[PDB]
Design an enzyme around this catalytic site. Structure first.
Site, short mmCIF file in Angstrom:
data_model
loop_
_atom_site.label_atom_id
_atom_site.label_comp_id
_atom_site.label_asym_id
_atom_site.label_seq_id
_atom_site.Cartn_x
_atom_site.Cartn_y
_atom_site.Cartn_z
N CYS A 260 36.23 31.56 39.73
CA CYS A 260 37.35 31.96 40.26
C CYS A 260 38.21 30.93 40.25
O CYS A 260 37.93 29.86 40.95
CB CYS A 260 37.19 32.72 41.30
SG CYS A 260 38.85 33.32 42.36
N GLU B 117 41.18 42.75 49.05
CA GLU B 117 42.32 41.99 49.65
C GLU B 117 43.26 42.07 48.47
O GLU B 117 43.03 42.33 47.43
CB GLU B 117 41.85 40.48 50.08
CG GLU B 117 41.39 39.72 48.97
CD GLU B 117 40.57 38.35 49.34
OE1 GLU B 117 41.11 37.31 48.86
OE2 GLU B 117 39.87 38.52 50.31
N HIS C 221 47.03 39.20 47.93
CA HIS C 221 47.77 37.80 48.48
C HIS C 221 48.63 37.15 47.54
O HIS C 221 48.46 37.97 46.28
CB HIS C 221 46.76 36.54 48.99
CG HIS C 221 45.53 36.64 47.90
ND1 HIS C 221 45.97 36.36 46.67
CD2 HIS C 221 44.36 36.84 47.90
CE1 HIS C 221 44.69 36.34 45.82
NE2 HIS C 221 43.83 36.82 47.02
N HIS D 242 42.23 44.00 45.06
CA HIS D 242 41.25 43.26 44.26
C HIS D 242 39.95 43.31 44.90
O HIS D 242 40.07 42.93 46.33
CB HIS D 242 41.39 42.25 43.40
CG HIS D 242 41.60 40.89 44.29
ND1 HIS D 242 42.91 40.61 44.62
CD2 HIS D 242 40.99 39.93 44.71
CE1 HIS D 242 42.88 39.26 45.37
NE2 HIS D 242 41.75 39.21 45.32
N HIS E 87 44.88 35.01 40.80
CA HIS E 87 43.43 34.60 40.36
C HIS E 87 43.05 34.83 38.93
O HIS E 87 43.55 35.58 38.16
CB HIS E 87 42.40 35.56 40.91
CG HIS E 87 42.25 35.45 42.33
ND1 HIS E 87 41.43 34.31 43.08
CD2 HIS E 87 42.44 36.39 43.33
CE1 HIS E 87 41.50 34.64 44.36
NE2 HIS E 87 41.83 35.76 44.51
MN LIG Z 1 41.60 37.07 46.78
#
Ligand SMILES: [Mn+2]
Ligand SMILES: [Mn+2]
Lengths: 148, 148
Positions: free
Chosen positions: A113, A59, A61, A99, A65
């Site tokens: 995370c 994914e 976004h 990622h 992270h």
């Molecule tokens: Mn993610």
């Protein structure tokens, strides 16, 4: 069943475990635990555990992270960088990078995370996206399960 | 020098180490490394390492902390809760609680510390503050180095 592998699991009792329901699912053998959220902390700290041969969702976004490997070993891709990862490696995932984390066939991968509490929903790749990704050889190798 | 103890140290090369200069200092044998900051992450993830017999500054402030013990063992106080801590225990420190981490005489204590990027300066206790703190027996025991 001649071989039944051992697998320890990391837990903090009092923190809920979310095991993700698999079907057509873009993930495989994933659990999450939220270690820190609320208290006027603008960040969340989560712990993801990927079971042997599993993977997180490929994914991207807007939100970044920060990942710190906590248990086991495996492989990560961010953008077109593919690397082996082990405790306590740092993986930095800038906004909009594709990622994914991948557990080896024989071992679970656990990682912390950190994300922003307020954040956008993940987007999954289209067929076009996958094909641009797959134009890199190491990326295709990673997505085929062959990064080791 | 008949005894020279071993001490491993956790590092991520490429991340700067800040060793704090001791004098009249309220801390003792402390280093910090910033693992994640920037990237539009509204949180910071730091790693603190407290050397044997050391301690973090006894302080309080508006911003919350989420701590995950990463290396060694030791003791923590938050408010008037005193506990032994070890990897990978979670310590939740609400805004304005007095807090301190203490390393045993024989071992370093390492922990991750998530805070907000935008945050207030720490305040140190007055003589009045210390005396209210010390009215609890476990707290006085902790501050005297005797929590073990
Ligand atoms: Mn993610
Ligand atoms: Mn503090």
């Amino acid at each position: 069943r001649p071989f039944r592998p051992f697998q320890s699991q990391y837990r903090w009792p009092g923190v809920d475990l979310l095991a993700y329901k698999e079907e057509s699912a873009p993930f495989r053998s994933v659990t999450r635990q939220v270690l820190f959220s609320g208290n006027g902390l603008t960040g969340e700290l989560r712990y993801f555990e990927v079971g042997p041969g599993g993977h997180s969702t490929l994914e991207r976004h807007q939100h970044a992270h920060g990942v710190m490997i906590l248990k086991g070993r495996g492989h990560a891709m961010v953008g077109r960088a593919v690397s082996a990862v082990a405790p306590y490696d740092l993986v930095t995932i800038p906004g909009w990078s594709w990622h994914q984390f991948r557990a080896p066939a024989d071992e679970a991968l656990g990682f912390l995370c950190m994300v922003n509490a307020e954040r956008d929903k993940p987007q999954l790749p289209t067929e076009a996206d996958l094909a641009m990704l797959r134009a890199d050889d190491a990326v295709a190798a990673f997505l085929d399960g062959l990064a080791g």
